[PDB]
Amino acid sequence: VRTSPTGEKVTHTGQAYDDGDYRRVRFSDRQKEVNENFAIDLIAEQPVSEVGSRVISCDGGGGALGHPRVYINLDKETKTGTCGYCGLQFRQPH
Amino acid sequence: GSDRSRFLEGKRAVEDKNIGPLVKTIMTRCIQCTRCIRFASEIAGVDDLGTTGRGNDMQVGTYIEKMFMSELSGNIIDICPVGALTSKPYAFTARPWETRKTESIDVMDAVGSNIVVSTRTGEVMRILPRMHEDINEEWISDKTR
Amino acid sequence: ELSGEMVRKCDPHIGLLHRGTEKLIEYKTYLQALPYFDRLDYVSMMCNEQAYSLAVEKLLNIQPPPRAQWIRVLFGEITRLLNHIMAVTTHALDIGAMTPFFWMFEEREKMFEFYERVSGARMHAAYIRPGGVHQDLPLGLLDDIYEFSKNFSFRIDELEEMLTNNRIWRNRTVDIGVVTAEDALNYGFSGVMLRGSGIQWDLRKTQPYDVYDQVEFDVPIGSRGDCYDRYLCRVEEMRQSLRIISQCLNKMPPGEIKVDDAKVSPPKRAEMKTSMESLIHHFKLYTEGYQVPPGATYTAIEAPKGEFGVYLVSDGSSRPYRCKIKAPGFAHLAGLDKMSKGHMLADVVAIIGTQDIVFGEVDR
Amino acid sequence: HHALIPHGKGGRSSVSGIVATVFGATGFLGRYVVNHLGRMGSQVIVPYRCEPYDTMHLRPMGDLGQIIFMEWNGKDKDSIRKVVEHSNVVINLVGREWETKNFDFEDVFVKIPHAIAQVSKEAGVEKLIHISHLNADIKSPSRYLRSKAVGEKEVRAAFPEATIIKPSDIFGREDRFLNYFASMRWFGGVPLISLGKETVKQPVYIVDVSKGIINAIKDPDAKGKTFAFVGPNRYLLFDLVQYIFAVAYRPFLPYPLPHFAYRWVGRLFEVSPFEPWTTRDKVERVHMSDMTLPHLPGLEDLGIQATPLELKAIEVLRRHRTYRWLTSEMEDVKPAKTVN
Amino acid sequence: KVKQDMPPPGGYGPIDYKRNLPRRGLSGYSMFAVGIGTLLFGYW
Amino acid sequence: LKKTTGLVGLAVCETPHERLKILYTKILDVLGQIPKNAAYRKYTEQITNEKLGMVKAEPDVKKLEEQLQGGQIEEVILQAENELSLARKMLRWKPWEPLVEEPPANQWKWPI
Amino acid sequence: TYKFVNMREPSMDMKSVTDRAAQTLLWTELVRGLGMTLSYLFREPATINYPFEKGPLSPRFRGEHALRRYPSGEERCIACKLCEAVCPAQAITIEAEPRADGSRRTTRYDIDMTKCIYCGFCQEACPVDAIVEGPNFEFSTETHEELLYNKEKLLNNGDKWEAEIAANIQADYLYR
Amino acid sequence: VKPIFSRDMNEAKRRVRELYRAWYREVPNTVHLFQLDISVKQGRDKVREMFMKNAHVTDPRVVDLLVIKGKMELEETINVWKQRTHIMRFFHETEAPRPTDFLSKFYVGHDP
Amino acid sequence: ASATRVIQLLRNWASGRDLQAKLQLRYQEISKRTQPPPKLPVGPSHKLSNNYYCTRDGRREAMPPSIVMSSQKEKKAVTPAPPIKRWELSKDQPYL
Amino acid sequence: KLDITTLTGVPEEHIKTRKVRIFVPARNNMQSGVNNTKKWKMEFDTRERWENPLMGWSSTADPLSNLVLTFSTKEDAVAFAEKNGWSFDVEERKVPKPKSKSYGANFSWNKRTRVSTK
Amino acid sequence: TRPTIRPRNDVVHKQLSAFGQYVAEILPKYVQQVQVSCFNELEIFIHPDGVIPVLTFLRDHTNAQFKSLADLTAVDVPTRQNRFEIVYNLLSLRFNSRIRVKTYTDELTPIESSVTVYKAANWYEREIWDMFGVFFANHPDLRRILTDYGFEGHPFRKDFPLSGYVELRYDDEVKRVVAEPVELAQEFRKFDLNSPWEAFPAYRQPPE
Amino acid sequence: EDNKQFFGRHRWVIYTTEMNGRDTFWDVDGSMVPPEWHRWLHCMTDDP
Ligand SMILES: NC(=O)C1=CN([C@@H]2O[C@H](COP(=O)(O)OP(=O)(O)OC[C@H]3O[C@@H](n4cnc5c(N)ncnc54)[C@H](OP(=O)(O)O)[C@@H]3O)[C@@H](O)[C@H]2O)C=CC1
Ligand code: SF4
Ligand code: SF4
Ligand code: SF4
Ligand code: SF4
């Protein structure tokens, strides 16, 4: 969560009010509600799982409590397979 | 079709192919209709897309790391029945029901291709071809699209 | 127009709560329109939901599952208990009693808790939908309903003790609001308004809808067509609803709560997350909705306030072309002027109470 | 820097492009100014020194988010900087007809406006509108108008391109000018210095003043110009008060009072800890005839035709009528004699 | 094994649904007698 | 003699058979004026004659009510009066005549 | 099939006449009603000591909307917009763009808590369980604008109530 | 075509004149009862303006329906069904003037 | 409840009924808030064979209304339906 | 010469300044379905939409922005537009021209229609 | 068997068809078409002139005793020349059956009031006049119900926008609630939901 | 918790006198209840 030149806290979307913008007045004696937790950083932090099969399935964890089950091809050595929903990454060993 | 699935086995997955900066490819969604190959051969004239392999492992796309470059390449996005081939610039931006469709004419060229300008909340979201058998059959150039 | 306190002319002005519900329904899919019917009659939400569901199912040519039907009948009778509690207690409060209101509204709170447990909304739940009911009863709800029903009779008896035989209450209602049976029929009156006058008509028996053919209850009929007789009819109807609730509790069937057709009723969450066809159908049902075969139907139920009807015309799309709601209160408020003739202002208040008008229904 | 393109059809939801800080918006003129700003779609920032309850009436005036209330102190410059930081326009309407222990005429009409103008110039606000009585002059008997003239000089000093609007008595429903004369019925006869024959006044309708201010904000030429706001007709005080009582259908009993006696009475009412009914300054300002300043531009320059007092008097003075005359039409009372 | 909210085996107990307004009080003759006796004692 | 019909506004008729006979005879008289080939006359006469024969045959009010299946006999007399009024208005309306006008081309087409 | 309310005839025997006369003159029935009120006076009151005591609620309660996350911390939303589509009041505004990672995430997610009807849809509709009406009901505000929620506000609510929301979803996930 | 109330334009004009008379006499009573601050002349001018707005109608049925709507509005005003807000809505006081010249529309916005 | 015996007697006598037996306020009789996980049954169409949707497609079995009579190209009198049968007084409680 | 403009209640600006387009909606090229190309549609001219200052939601002042009407035939839509006194522009229906399709042509001996890949 | 699909009752279908033919024969002057829906509902289509005669026939026992007007409403289909379809729903308690009679009208063509026949059509016809633009002749009192006292347009007419043309707010300047042109802060988002593929082949209209 | 008391009064919470830098000795509110105890207090769960 970086801070913009005006002193506002830039959101995860990247939204920050420019010095020219008059809409910054809305926070004059109030606060701008920004979620400190950023999805991109946390998803990056997760370790990459290494699986020995060409295709693996991600349900998001918790079965029916997660996301629709999808099968990911891991043939490409260069790039890890990434779940469309979960965002977790997998790659074949070696 | 039926409203339920009797398929109790694991599904197949296909490694995605990169065919350019305009068409986003998720080949696991491909249904091997071969529309893209026939379009590229017949209309575009570029015989670079084809089927490699046999059986359930049959895959559609350049065997090599070739890029499908043509004026009419974007039309494969429209032709593809499934979302295997999708517009990279338009990816994730909007859903079909939201968009308001306005029928208009392109100005990039003098062909006068008829187009549908899709706008949501006052913002242009995409340009889609409109059928005029005389001027543009169902296709538009990459610059128009 | 009052000469003294005698009402020479009573002219009802409505539309103070007209929210354009019918126009808005045309812009919504059938599922999206379902919450509207909860709001039409705030006191009897689930019955209106059932009426809409019956209309949509008849147009769809699909049949709700049996357990769904029994759940619908049970919660409809609970809604009738709520509606009659509200009507009788608010009528007494307007005529000045003011204690049975609190007494019975405690039980109304308990029935609201049943609503919340099933749906998560104390009132205005979307539980009853075309094709069945959204979710199966939470485990333990039926025994709790039994606990409530076993004791509710004492509360109704105490209310009768307060009001039934009181000289003051009988004076305020004994011969006010008399309506002839032929006048009641012509003016479009339904429910207790007809039955108070002595006409024997209850759609639950004459034209059963969901499972009322399989339950036993007695239609209370009145003899004098007065406010007092209608109050007696409503109390006896509450007791008969308790009888029906016991019957529904004992004979609840096992099985599915929504039609096993994924092109009308959404698939189960696990199936949608595990099966491609289920995911496709969930996506389409929650974005486009289910197309209804073109047609028109007038489906009516014996709602707690009378006959509730929906004239639904379908153009074959996912959104209804026209939806006309027949509110029982409309004709009763129309006949209020005829009923008020020859009475005073307090009699007019009592007559307004007798016809159990919720103006969300009247104005729509 | 803080420039917004206007968008919309001028409705509640539209964006006028006007971001304004209306000082003293919790008052007779502030209400109408804020209403006119909000209807266009402008963003209105209201500095309030009173309880939030008193500002509640202004809450419905604007669409969601348009009206922002920020507490401010006249003595503290930092609050002025906070309020005026993001505004492209600032309107100063801070004025009390009665002096108070904490704030005298000097502070309200000189110090406050000067601080506002200086902080606005520092902040970068494009436009500033300041209000000073038409009768304002450094040699006037009333301290109110004297401080008004000094404040006008100081504001012009701090903000060279500032529009200064000099309005006459502004008659309106919440006015303290027509209500002041009507309220004199409770005390029996209407005390008038010289019976009001020697005094001539040119009242202005409140809506006209607010529309003039808004048009001045809209008008590019208004910068660095002093406008005089005056009504269509000039009246003798006797005729005007008689017309007030006639429209109120209350008996008129004019009795001449010596100036010193009226000043003593004004001193008596000044004693009240709460809002004084009348002050010696009030008596002096009432007696003082409205100045005629042909040089200054007026409402006609801004495009608004002044509404005559006759048309709008019934609005202000109907409430003072008794039950017998509450329903009487406006036309029953003929227009008062005009000294024009 | 299926587990839905179902009625207890054998069903629920019977639920009372009819008016039970009780019969209470002395006979009219007795109440009048008591009132008259009180009146007479008060008079004496 | 039933104390009450049970429906408010409807009073027990002391002479039900006589009233029903008179009403049915009047209905037949009105029907006679209507053209012979009019369906209204044929059907209404068929219904009336059956009702009048039933009324004459049965001397007991309860048995007659069971046979007629029209509810309580007072309701039957009320329906007879309604029929008489209809027959009288029918004569003026002359519904038996051909259709006044065919609808526009697609006035009853749905879906549109 | 049908029952007769009223339709009872009083007995004319001297004892019954005397009883009814006593009721009229001696006000027996009003006394019975008075006794009922007194009995209620001596019964325990039903009032709960709010705020200290809170009324019962079930896991299926529909309250303040919330945006949930995966256990990793990634937001569950995949910008399906089907939850926007099913909203009966059109209270949800969603805009999305491919994020730097390349994932389908929502740049804008707004629920107008003033146009919402708290139907409970989009909790059933949303495929990934991202949007959930949580347990909170005491979110009254002093301004209208506070009730126009933003993606940041919804995510903050999800973080605040995740402990309760997860338990309730666990309780009711099998019924769904 | 079936006439609503008038078979020809002259009859509809007669009905329109009757309605205008009714409004013209009602205007002062409206100003008195609703405690409106407009003058009687102002209200009668507004009545004329409302009548003149539909002066282009050339079809008798449209004129008859307009007279019906005007009679309903007059009934509302004669009673107090309409409030001062409803009566003063005819005078669009709150709405700002909208320029009709081409240049002003060009300056203000994109509207045609 | 927690009422003393004297108050219970007073309330019961005033009511004319035994209030203790049926108490409006709810006690340990209510169902436990936490319940064992459910296992909801599947419906009739959850089969792996002979389940083709064409057989069970209700909507596609709807048909446009049948036209009995159209203007644009003895017999016994008939009624809309057989006349309704009179209701029978309830056995449990014919008169309330 | 039917005119319901006075009776409709529409304000004059929308009656006079609005152009209504009568057309058969073109098929969405993304899909091969043609069911949504079988009925004429009447749609009003687009007007300004601006962003709300508070939330950025698209605001409009055009009452008829979302108004779309379906007509079985072009003449009916024209009649409705004339009766309501809206200026109308009619775009003639576009129908796919008949095509000649041969699977055998894919394997022609001498023509260029032979397909390199199947 | 076939649990999902709704059970069909042919007996009621035959009875309703027979009674529809009965009505068509008795009143050929007004009835144009009678059809029985496959959910067992009977509709008789009548010329606009026949509302009073056909309704009076239905109420009075020519083997039909529909003495209750369930509801009266109109459906605005702009395509048709007579854009309004007046619908009457009647209930016969003697025969426990319901039938529907439908007629058409234009904006300029009056339709006779049925207050004489039924007396519950006063408010229903007033609502039809208020929302739709139909005028019922000889009505005892035709005025607005469910709309504002000064409302100008006729809603429910498929031309009227859902949000309308005017909006109400309180104005401090005039100390009054004042109408103004509608200006939505969030324009209603029109969703095109119809699928390009036909769902019901049974109702496929002829290609023409 | 007092299980003897009737349902709705068996569980109650005594709000803290100081929370998040606010004096709540007199001013208490429902939102002060943390989410984990919210379900216990509102009877959504029987387990504290
Ligand atoms: N006829 C007229 O109205 C004329 C107008 N003017 C000037 O224009 C303005 C018109 O206001 P008017 O209609 O009289 O209504 P007010 O007297 O209510 O105007 C004063 C406004 O400023 C605020 N205010 C007053 N004193 C102070 C202070 N010491 N510090 C900070 N804020 C203060 C008041 O809020 P609060 O109550 O909270 O203090 C109120 O909003 C005044 O400035 C006046 O001098 C000039 C000539 C004639
Ligand atoms: S058009 Fe799409 S589905 Fe067909 S072969 Fe090409 S990628 Fe696969
Ligand atoms: S929506 Fe269609 S294209 Fe997209 S994944 Fe599903 S089946 Fe494939
Ligand atoms: S479930 Fe919620 S967050 Fe996820 S795509 Fe749907 S609306 Fe967006
Ligand atoms: S629960 Fe709220 S967000 Fe979800 S559909 Fe209902 S109103 Fe919209």
3-state SS, K70-107, equals EEEEEEECCCCCCCEEEEEEEEECCCCEEEEEEEEECC
| Cβ partners under 8 Å of residue G28, min gap 6 | E25, G22
HSE (side-chain half, CA atoms, 13 Å) at D170? 24
Which helix or strand (DSSP H or E) is residue B83 part of?
none
Confirm or reject: Cβ of D167 under 6 Å from ligand 1. Answer: yes
Window 16-45 of I, Cβ < 8 Å to B: 45
Pick from K120, H20, F107, J112: which is nearest to C329 by CA? K120
C53, C130 Cβ separation under 8 angstroms: yes
B107-133: burial string, b at 16+ Cβ within 10 Å, e else? eeeeeebbbbbbbbbeeebbbbbbbbe
C274, A68 Cβ separation under 8 angstroms: yes
Window 58-117 of G, Cβ < 8 Å to L: 58-59, 61
- Rounded to the nearest 5°, which phi and psi values hold at C270? -60, -45
| Rounded Cα distance, B95 and G95, in Å | 10
| Rounded Cα distance, D92 and D156, in Å | 13
Which tokens hold the place of C252?
């609840």
For residue D82, give the 3-state DSSP assignment: helix
Which tokens hold the place of L46?
């029987």
Pocket-forming residues, ligand 5, beta carbon under 6 Å: G 65, 87-89, 91-92, 111, 116-122, 133
- Rounded to the nearest 5°, which phi and psi values hold at I6? -60, -45
Greatest C-alpha distance within chain D: 60
Pick from J118, A82, J30, C275: which is nearest to B26 by CA? A82
Beta bridge partners of K44: K34, K101
| Rounded Cα distance, C132 and K3, in Å | 13
The residue count of chain B comes to 145
| Rounded Cα distance, D202 and D299, in Å | 13
Torsion-angle region of A85 (φ positive above 0: left; ψ -120 to 50: alpha; else: beta): alpha
Pick from E16, L7, C107: which is nearest to I29 by CA? L7
CA angle D231, D233, D237 (to 5 degrees): 100
D30, D22 Cβ separation under 8 angstroms: yes
Which tokens hold the place of A91?
């790659």
Identity (one letter) of the amino acid at F68? Answer: L
Greatest C-alpha distance within chain J: 71
| Rounded Cα distance, G121 and G133, in Å | 9
| Rounded Cα distance, H51 and K13, in Å | 55
Identity (one letter) of the amino acid at B78? Answer: D
The residue count of chain D comes to 340
C243, C41 Cβ separation under 8 angstroms: no
Measured in Å, residue B83 CA sits from the centre of ligand 3 at 6
C-alpha dihedral sign at B99, B104, B110, B113 = positive
User: What is the Cα Rg of chain A in Å?
Assistant: 20
Pick from H109, K41, G40, G175: which is nearest to C133 by CA? G175
Question: Strand K84-92 to strand K68-76: parallel, antiparallel, or no bridges (unpaired)?
Answer: antiparallel
Chain K: nearest CA to J117, how far in angstroms?
A: 30
Which tokens hold the place of I14?
């005033």
State the residue for tokens 């506000």: G153
Asked if omega into D254 is within 30° of 0 (cis), the reply is: no
Binding residues of B for [4Fe-4S] cluster: 30, 33, 36, 80, 83
DSSP K119-139: SSHHHHHHHHHHHS---EET-
Question: Strand B114-120 to strand B100-105: parallel, antiparallel, or no bridges (unpaired)?
Answer: antiparallel
For residue G126, give the 3-state DSSP assignment: coil
Give the helix, strand, coil percentages of chain J, each rounded to 5: 25, 20, 55
Q: Between the CA atoms of H45, H46, H52 and H53, what dihedral angle is there, to the nearest 10 degrees? A: 160
| Rounded Cα distance, D282 and D180, in Å | 10
For residue F72, give the 3-state DSSP assignment: coil
CB neighbour class for E24 (10 Å; exposed up to 12, middle 13-18, buried from 19)? exposed
Q: What is the DSSP letter of C134?
A: S
| Rounded Cα distance, J27 and D337, in Å | 76
Helices (H) and strands (E) in chain L, counts: 1, 2
For residue C180, give the 3-state DSSP assignment: coil
Question: Strand D19-23 to strand D43-48: parallel, antiparallel, or no bridges (unpaired)?
Answer: parallel
Cross-chain residue pair I89–G6, CB shorter than 8 Å: no
Window 13-52 of F, Cβ < 8 Å to I: 42-43, 46-47
Which tokens hold the place of G134?
């949580």
How far from the centroid of its chain's Cα atoms is residue G70's Cα? 26
| Rounded Cα distance, J102 and J99, in Å | 10
How far from the centroid of its chain's Cα atoms is residue J88's Cα? 13
| Rounded Cα distance, G16 and G13, in Å | 5
| Cβ partners under 8 Å of residue C223, min gap 6 | C198, C229, F4, F6, F8, G4, G5, G6, G7
* Nearest atom (ligand 1) to Cα of D174: 13
Beta bridge partners of J19: J87
Q: At what angle do helices F73-93 and F61-68 cross, to 10 degrees?
A: 50
Which helix or strand (DSSP H or E) is residue D213 part of?
helix D206-218
| Rounded Cα distance, H78 and H73, in Å | 9
CB neighbour class for D165 (10 Å; exposed up to 12, middle 13-18, buried from 19)? buried
Which helix or strand (DSSP H or E) is residue A12 part of?
none
Experimental method: cryo-EM
- Rounded to the nearest 5°, which phi and psi values hold at C134? -65, -45
I24, G46 Cβ separation under 8 angstroms: yes
- Rounded to the nearest 5°, which phi and psi values hold at C325? -100, 125
Measured in Å, residue D119 CA sits from the centre of ligand 1 at 20
Cross-chain residue pair K153–J8, CB shorter than 8 Å: yes
- Rounded to the nearest 5°, which phi and psi values hold at C186? -65, -40
Resolution in angstroms comes to 2.9
Question: Strand C295-303 to strand L22-23: parallel, antiparallel, or no bridges (unpaired)?
Answer: unpaired
Cross-chain residue pair C135–G60, CB shorter than 8 Å: yes
Question: Strand D190-193 to strand D89-92: parallel, antiparallel, or no bridges (unpaired)?
Answer: unpaired
Distances (CA, A) of J99 to B113, B133, J96, K173: 21, 11, 9, 69
HSE (side-chain half, CA atoms, 13 Å) at D244? 25
Window 13-52 of I, Cβ < 8 Å to C: 15-17, 22-24, 26, 29-32, 35-36, 38, 40-46
- Rounded to the nearest 5°, which phi and psi values hold at C25? -60, -35
Which tokens hold the place of D259?
């100036």
| Rounded Cα distance, D170 and C127, in Å | 61
Pick from C91, C84, C111, C109: which is nearest to C236 by CA? C84
| Rounded Cα distance, A71 and A49, in Å | 14
Pick from K101, K100, K98: which is nearest to K48 by CA? K101
Say how many C-beta atoms besides its own lie within 10 A of residue D271's C-beta. 7
Considering only CB atoms, C181 lies closest to which of F8, F110, F112, namely F8
- Rounded to the nearest 5°, which phi and psi values hold at C74? -60, -50
| Rounded Cα distance, C152 and C157, in Å | 9
Which helix or strand (DSSP H or E) is residue D190 part of?
strand D190-193
DSSP B47-75: TT--EESSGGG-EES-SSS-----TTTTH
Measured in Å, residue D200 CA sits from the centre of ligand 4 at 71
Question: Strand D190-193 to strand D170-171: parallel, antiparallel, or no bridges (unpaired)?
Answer: unpaired
Q: What is the DSSP letter of B103?
A: E
| Rounded Cα distance, D169 and B52, in Å | 91
Decide: F and A in contact? Rule: 3+ Cβ pairs under 8 Å: no
C166, E31 Cβ separation under 8 angstroms: no
Measured in Å, residue B10 CA sits from the centre of ligand 2 at 22
